[PDB]
Write a protein that binds this ligand. Structure first.
Ligand SMILES: Cc1cc2cc(Oc3ccnc(Nc4cccc(CS(=O)(=O)NCCN(C)C)c4)n3)ccc2[nH]1
Length: 306
């Protein structure tokens, strides 16, 4: 029995013997995510199995870690469901460690998904996958961007600021639906280390708007700046931002007006949309509502023949 009072919500609680735990999906310093099969997740369909992702704490986990995971779960309930975010499906709070059960995205994060779909040749770096998949169409790429914009428009409408929107935090389902992840994470109460890599080797400083970098100010406008970086990641098919640029240099550069150059395969229109997201002045960036409307139009005009 836990020493803590884990919050049981009858609408969401699943007996944990309805979960058949499967392979690890990922592990961080937080805990771990595993794939599972859930039996009768939908009450009206008790005999059906659903593949799901299950988040749980490491054994080394503290009380703040627990509080953080509960917090993510409750924030997700409050934000509600949208097609282009990772949605809550249930929880196990009784009879063992806390499990938070969410939609499963079988194709993993967007950066690695795009990298494995890199065609040969001059416009992209090499494909690092030993199981490369069919390359995407131009329309497919704009449609990835559109779906992420639509998810952020929803989150913004629910007053959620993501604060680390990046291709690594977009997951892709079996049906190639884009789903924003890690939007419900607690904001650390301590100052951050700008030079500390994630468990997957990423430096989050490269997605920060200048006002976030400089003064730790995060708003929907600073998420639009990150979406501009994410756009650049899409049209480089998973490229790494500011190539050759040491991180301790980045703010100076940005402040002087430095911006990433256009990816080799990227329309003038989509590069101008990136640059607009990277407006120095937060009030002058487009909103996610505007981004969605423009990307909708651009998707309809973009060829899926190549
Ligand atoms: C409460 C909560 C639960 C939760 C679960 C999350 O993870 C989820 C949720 C839904 N689906 C997937 N699918 C998935 C499939 C393959 C691999 C991965 C992990 S990965 O880091 O993107 N790539 C694996 C190895 N790379 C580093 C080489 C995830 N994960 C992510 C955030 C979450 N927040």
């Amino acid at each position: 029995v836990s020493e803590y009072e884990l919050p049981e919500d009858p609408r969401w609680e699943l007996p944990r013997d309805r979960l058949v735990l499967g392979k690890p999906l990922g592990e961080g310093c937080f805990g771990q995510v595993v794939l599972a099969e859930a039996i009768g997740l939908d009450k009206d369909k008790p005999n059906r199995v659903t593949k799901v992702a299950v988040k749980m704490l490491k054994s080394d986990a503290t009380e703040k870690d627990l509080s953080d995971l509960i917090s993510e779960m409750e924030m997700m309930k409050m934000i509600g469901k949208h097609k282009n975010i990772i949605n809550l499906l249930g929880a196990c709070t009784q009879d063992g460690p806390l499990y938070v059960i969410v939609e499963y995205a079988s194709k993993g994060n967007l950066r690695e998904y795009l990298q494995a779909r890199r065609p040969p040749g001059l416009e992209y770096s090499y494909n690092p996958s030993h199981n490369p998949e069919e390359q995407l169409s131009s329309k497919d790429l704009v449609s990835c961007a559109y779906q992420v914009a639509r998810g952020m428009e929803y989150l913004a409408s629910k007053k959620c600021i993501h604060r680390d929107l990046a291709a690594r935090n977009v997951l892709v389902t079996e049906d190639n639906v884009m789903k924003i992840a890690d939007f419900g994470l607690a904001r650390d109460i301590h100052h951050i280390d700008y030079y500390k890599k994630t468990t997957n080797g990423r430096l989050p400083v490269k997605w920060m708007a200048p006002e976030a970098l400089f003064d730790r100010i995060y708003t929907h406008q600073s998420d639009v700046w990150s979406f501009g970086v994410l756009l650049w990641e899409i049209f480089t098919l998973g490229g790494s931002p500011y190539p050759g640029v040491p991180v301790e240099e980045l703010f100076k550069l940005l402040k002087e007006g430095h911006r990433m150059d256009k990816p080799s395969n990227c329309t003038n229109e989509l590069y101008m949309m990136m640059r607009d997201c990277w407006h120095a002045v937060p009030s002058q960036r487009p909103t996610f509502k505007q981004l969605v409307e423009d990307l909708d139009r651009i998707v309809a005009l973009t060829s899926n023949q190549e």
